[model samples]
Target chain A: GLAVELKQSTAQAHEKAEHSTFMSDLLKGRLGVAEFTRLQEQAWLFYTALEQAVDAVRASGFAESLLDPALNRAEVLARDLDKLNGSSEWRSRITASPAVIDYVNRLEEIRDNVDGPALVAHHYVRYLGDLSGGQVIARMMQRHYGVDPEALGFYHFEGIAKLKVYKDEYREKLNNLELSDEQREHLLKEATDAFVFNHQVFADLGKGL
Target chain B: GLAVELKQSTAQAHEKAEHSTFMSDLLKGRLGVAEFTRLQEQAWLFYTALEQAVDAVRASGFAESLLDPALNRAEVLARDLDKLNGSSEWRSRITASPAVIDYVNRLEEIRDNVDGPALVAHHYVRYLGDLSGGQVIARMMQRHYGVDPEALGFYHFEGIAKLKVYKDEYREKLNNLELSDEQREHLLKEATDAFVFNHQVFADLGKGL
Candidate 1:
């Protein structure tokens, strides 16, 4: 029940994020390298928080089994930050906006307190969206700014053999979580919040720009 | 200023988390293979999330230039998790302990909204901890559960070429942030929270065991 509905819910959320100001700017080339840095700063909070939650579930053997190595890209942000700044004094510049703070805080609240179903829902919402739209983002980034795949490790998953199949595996991981009726409904509801948070994060960052 | 102080503060946090109940059990050989799996699981979440943040920070006119491909170990945890439980079907299991959630949430709150000073603090606290005490952990896992290096990828950082130099670079990045007096104080305060949260996470997992 949740597998299909969860997919549907995330699809809608994913679309909302796709259509947000951040994504809009990125797609249309209104975003300069500066705003692009802000987007990464925004993403750093959410992805780092969710990954932390999934990690916390690991005492259970099954939780350990669900780990995906190439999937984590938070450190990739740091590395990218390093190269982009490249000995410049700019590494310390910028901070999170109101939207990013709100989004990160809320997602982490659920992450630290909630179960894997909820955690996985966020994972699917973030990573799955990354795999699909991120592919396009990589090309768009390079085409617009002369960046290449070598420079886009965040969008890259060298550890995963196949992107399409991995997306399905994530779906399987979600469905396999065995949510009850209440759990499914709650997770789906939480699922909707993912995009709302992103929308705010995008909007807030846009305002700063 | 914040860089050196941050290191000292994180050192204390590192000690407290290291001595938590979960780690103590493993160190004392109280936990079995099952616990080894749990430890890896816990690592998977935090490392994945931290790594994801770094990855998310990628792209940019200059941001892309700063990208460093070698960092974080979401994949490291995943690989070790895989080798430890090769092709295992244990996917949907376990929730985070209260302590684990607390640690991740607090650390990430600063992370999502904060800037380089705080980011470098966390990076130092975590990755440095791994480089230092991780050696002991690697040996403990092997001696306790017969796991070899292959299954203990969490302790390794293939991306970083030299641990000795990386630490200096991390410090360089932190000091380069050029925080105002207010900002430095803000980041230092946030850096202090890293340990407090970690102390809890380490304890929560220990108490559960």
Candidate 2:
């Protein structure tokens, strides 16, 4: 159990690092506008599809108690991704300077070798779990070492009241679906693959950084 | 009245031509990724706001047949814009190569000299109108001159049916909104300005092409 937990925790850590690196590259003008836009578009699509698949599972009526937390987490991550896509900070990062173009080109080169949809969903799930775990770590870090909340803002989730509202809606939509056990298994496998793929990307991106 | 109609038509023609030029510049890999993404994001925001305004007008207890058609066109344009935002082709175009990054940077230099949001919205709306007009023109040309759809397919729309559905939904939403005369006039002026600004971008892109 400890070994399994360690492996999961390490994979999550790598994902968090990858997310930070990717955002840094974008903000520092290392990623170009075109490449970034394409990545965002691809990411949106992948997440949309995954969200639908999750809904399908919920509709099956067999996994409500088992998959509810994961589904909620997925929705939260999806919302975060959407926010990043539409953020003023993101816009400012892209339009910052002409020199940032070089980063754009570099990102394209990076993307050319990547399966865009797989990469996006993979990292997404990883980051979600990482953020969730980090919240626990932050409390420990603060109590043990006196770290500030500002340093832990990335892990801070204010309240789950709104999140619960969204989760309930997702379940309602799921409850309306017609699905078989095979279809449910397939969707779960896809979510698992998303997590695995994200770990690989994190491994690669970490090495690149 | 004919003279006024002619003037309007001529202006629309000019806007169409300008949109082609800007889009070509983007497709040809003349613009950077960041600038391109920024323009796309800004366009989405402006069109969304405009849609709400249109809806408000339709809901107001007023009867203007012309308003319906205009609202319909706006709705169609908004859907087309959303498609562009979510488009795999558009994503591929930007992410095709690093050359696009350089091009986006060049465009940003020009954009820096103008009002940011206005410049972005202008280019976006004009590009949509021009693209729609181009599709119609291409079809006419193919029918009369016996050309291949393949030649036009590079830019022609194959998503028109889906687009129409989106447009209808947009209009229905607009019909439910309540807006004042001043707000409606202001939004129309904003739309016109969006085209004019796009025309300017075209003129600039033309020099580069």
Candidate 3:
């Protein structure tokens, strides 16, 4: 299955994301709310772009199935951002950093090309990662930063009754989608880049701290 | 589990909803797209209230766990409504039917009371029903009304990878929530009311025929 292949291929990159200096520091409670909120704002920008890409390519093929609206985070992120900022004016204070722009630009390119497989590649990296290690980060945020559950809406998936099962099916869907060896190779590459892009966002956000 | 108890208590009502004239006719392909879309518009009104109640009570007691945003349908319905109406102006055309108003009014009452169990009762009825019998209606809509999958986003729960597993866990969560026998009785009553409320909406929408 492409899920197994993608996981095995992306392991190193995933590890890199796990140990990214900014993320590690944030998880350790070394960051303030401002710094943490900055990361989420960047996430808002990233996911907004990713979802737009999802919409662009949703009609293209297997993407109709892969682009699950249940996993959508833009709205959740906005809600969380509002809680974090404590106002409707949160939008006025945020700006996409250079790394964020690069990340969004890459997604725009994939979307404009209607590259369904490529979109799925990024989709798997971000969302599966969200379901996986994303749980720990939220817990740490609660424990360390005292971030209320309401403000941490991005990490919660009420629609997903079972995370393990939901994630397994997501991978299964990935496997079931038609793909050639060449397409998978490209998918793997895009996923690797997805992780790298994430790490770069982390590194960029760390600059403010 | 309250889920099982609620289902059993509301069995007759559930049956009534299943065989409601409007729903049965729609399932039999005896109805036009206008009728089907009208039903969804009513759903939009109903779920908008349900979710609003969810938000109002999210911070109260066990509801923090039971009130899952993933089940939120207002936005998805709006999206589907737009697709069905083929324009953003769909809002201008839709007027909540009287039954829909009653449904929303009940939800608002429960929300204003901040009654967690009561809210969960409706939550179970509407959301679980959506995950259950609602699937068939979507399939029929496509088969009979030729509704595009895109326009039927309301039926798809991408967050729940395994519907059965998700639903089982939903029951498990319901069981785990702390409630007394008296509370359970009230919950059951409310659930029956929820189903009847659904039937009333169906009956109301059926009037157009």
lDDT, candidate 1, A1-209, per-residue tens:
55688767677766776688767888778777667766776676667776777676543333344567567888886666565556434446656678777666655654444355455556667777788988888788878876645657888887888888887777677667754454565567557776777777888877884
lDDT of 2 by residue, B35-127 (tens): 344344443334444444334433553323313333233334334434434444443342312323333343344244332222222333433
First chain of model 3: TM-score? 0.96
**Model 3 Cα shift for residue B192 (angstroms):** 52
RMSD of 1: 24.0
Residue B133 of model 3, lDDT score: 88
Poorest lDDT segment (10 consecutive residues) of candidate 3 chain A: A140-149
Q: What is the TM-score of each candidate against the true structure?
A: 0.47, 0.26, 0.50
Better of 1 and 3 by TM-score: 3
lDDT, residue A93, model 3: 80
Compute the lDDT for candidate 2: 0.40
Better of 1 and 2 by lDDT: 1
lDDT of 3 by residue, A1-209 (tens): 88898989999988997798898888775654567788999999999999989988886655577688899999999999888877878798888888889999999999899888789999998998899977888877654454556788999997889999988888788989888878778888999999989988888888745
lDDT of 1 by residue, B74-142 (tens): 776777776666544433554566766765665466446535445545565677677767867876655
